[PDB]
Design a protein around this ligand. Sequence first.
Ligand SMILES: O=C(O)CCCCC(=O)O
Length: 299
Amino acid sequence: DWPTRQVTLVVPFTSGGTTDMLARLIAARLSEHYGQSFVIDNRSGESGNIAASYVAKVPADGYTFIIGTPGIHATNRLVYRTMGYDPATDFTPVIVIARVPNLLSVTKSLPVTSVADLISYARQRPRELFYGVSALGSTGHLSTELFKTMTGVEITAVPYKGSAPMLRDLAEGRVHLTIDNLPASKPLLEAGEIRPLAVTTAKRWPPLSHLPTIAEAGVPGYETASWFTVGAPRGTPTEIVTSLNTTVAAFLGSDSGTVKLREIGAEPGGGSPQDMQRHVEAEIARWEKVAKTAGIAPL
Ligand SMILES: O=C(O)CCCCC(=O)O
């Protein structure tokens, strides 16, 4: 019987970022499978805290879900003092949608063609260059802060409300570089508007197999990545979480779905609701260490 009416997917960022891109794919698929609209509600604000506060409070009926992010589940606690919700108690896991490499890029007029170029360039100019942050506490933000710490470069963060506006500013050179999710960056690469230097992952991204990893390009042992989830309000019927998990997992593990995800710069996730929970718990732990090492904590 579920669902008999429209389902809402609350997305914590505006369109043109990776969250929204993934959500739309998922929404399209769910709508076709179940014969009801799965509609996106883009509710921006405070690195996803506004959307996560919202979905924590809604009826646990299976007509509202959160497209979760590393901020919401794991990293916002490293930069926000109080959040409005407790991710640990307020949600129940559904599925990890994807794992996503981050990409180090620079604005075209920055005369650097490699990670080592970038490090020398920035070392000559301490505290003059600016980097773009898609959201406070995002993996990009903390990835850049870690990069800073591992290389000794001093560059100043500019927060934006999502990937989309940060990337327009990166294209114009109002910031000089970013580390941010591949899928949102990729259209700007293909169009020539920004210059990619390296992926953040431990291995190269196969469809851009000739971009090096940051680790092999000069920063031994550097590795970061981002990921996205479906979460439900605490108390959501188990039959619903299991049906939803199964449907998403069949899309992600299908040949067709893997192709769609890899075409936009994302690796299909999949697995069980408890797999999501393990992943979240490990991410909490490991980014908490990153943040301490990078000098990042709530004001
Ligand atoms: O969807 C966006 O625009 C931003 C997502 C940032 C996710 C992350 O923390 O890497």
